């Protein structure tokens, strides 16, 4: 998955 808001 993604681990930061930018990638999210």
């Amino acid at each position, epitope marked *: 998955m993604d681990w930061n*808001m930018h990638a999210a």
Partner: antibody
Amino acid sequence: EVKVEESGGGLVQPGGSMKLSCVASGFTFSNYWMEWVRQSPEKGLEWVAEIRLKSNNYATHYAESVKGRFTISRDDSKSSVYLQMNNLRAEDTGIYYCTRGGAVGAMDYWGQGTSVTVSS
Amino acid sequence: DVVLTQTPLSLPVRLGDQASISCRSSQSLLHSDGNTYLHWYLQKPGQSPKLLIYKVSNRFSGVPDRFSGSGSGTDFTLKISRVEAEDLGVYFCSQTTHVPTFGGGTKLEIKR
């Protein structure tokens, strides 16, 4: 002027519990993920737990090392994030930092930390 | 988990000179979306660590161009030009491409 301040640190016996609190200001709290990272002289900085947005049903994620023992929660109305620590172990000793998951893709604002010591 | 190895552990530097801190990851930090989430922070004694560079080379709020970040594969470098007294502290890298991890830090010492 983003501000982040943690509290609740202290000494706890192995197997005990304690809840850490963090209050932020200077931004719309509900629009950001919040994180807890801890620092120890033997593991350095280590990510502990993360809690996302309401639209994510407050999805949480934990480091394998604290799985099932720590619980992260937040109260947007009070711009606070919490870390309930149970079944504490000596390895949990360290300075606990509360951080904002930034829109830039990095934990962008940190508090000064609150110290936690698990000892007999 | 991704391991971030920083070097040197201690870095003595004269005022006005440049300091280079390295961070080497155990795996590529290139996210499928094309971004590389490698960041740099500075933690002064007793103070809250502060974000300096995000996504390899972007300067964060209030950070002067004296601070520059670069990367090549699994190697990343933080360069602090025209070092000044207030630059002392521990600089550390972190990545958020995979489960968040951090480098061990580099203590910048001012050589006077």
